[PDB]
């Protein structure tokens, strides 16, 4: 599913991301925009053989099992295909583990390069939250 901007904000807010680990909702929306363009089914392959999955582009080396990533961990205890659902719950739950792990939202290179230090409140302006 391809979310609208305010639709995804609302969904993220109901799953408890606003201000999670001190990261306001506009941070998450901004990171989803550039990681995937709001498209749950998104995937992208990395040089090291891993793949990034879903709205938040979560990586199979550490966080999910795809069966084709050697030696990798599955710290979220889920198959990577669960991250492609129209129901973003599974991705949100996994992202809460990522952002708590020590580097905060710097785990998302699109966030670091395109959202960090910007007026990320823009991303939820206009929305009925
Ligand atoms: Na894995």
Swiss-Prot record:
Keywords: Allergen, Antimicrobial, Bacteriolytic enzyme, Disulfide bond, Glycosidase, Hydrolase, Secreted, Signal
Segments crossing the lipid bilayer: none
Keyword NADP: no
InterPro entries with a match to the protein in the record: Glyco_hydro_22, Glyco_hydro_22_CS, Glyco_hydro_22_lys, Lysozyme-like_dom_sf
Ranges of residues in domain C-type lysozyme: 1-129
Gene Ontology molecular-function annotations: beta-N-acetylglucosaminidase activity; identical protein binding; lysozyme activity
EC class (word): hydrolase
The protein's Enzyme Commission number: 3.2.1.17
Keyword Transmembrane helix: no
Gene Ontology biological process terms in this record: cell wall macromolecule catabolic process; defense response to bacterium; defense response to Gram-negative bacterium; defense response to Gram-positive bacterium; killing of cells of another organism
Locations listed in the record: Secreted
Covalent S-S links between cysteines: 6-127, 30-115, 64-80, 76-94
Positions bound to substrate: 101
GO CC annotations on file: cytoplasm; endoplasmic reticulum; extracellular space
Further details from the record: Lysozyme C is capable of both hydrolysis and transglycosylation; it also shows a slight esterase activity. It acts rapidly on both peptide-substituted and unsubstituted peptidoglycan, and slowly on chitin oligosaccharides.
Stored PANTHER family: LYSOZYME C (PTHR11407:SF28)
Family: Belongs to the glycosyl hydrolase 22 family.
Record note on quaternary structure: Monomer.
Function per UniProt: Lysozymes have primarily a bacteriolytic function; those in tissues and body fluids are associated with the monocyte-macrophage system and enhance the activity of immunoagents. Has bacteriolytic activity against M.luteus.
The protein's name: Lysozyme C
Lineage: Eukaryota, Metazoa, Chordata, Craniata, Vertebrata
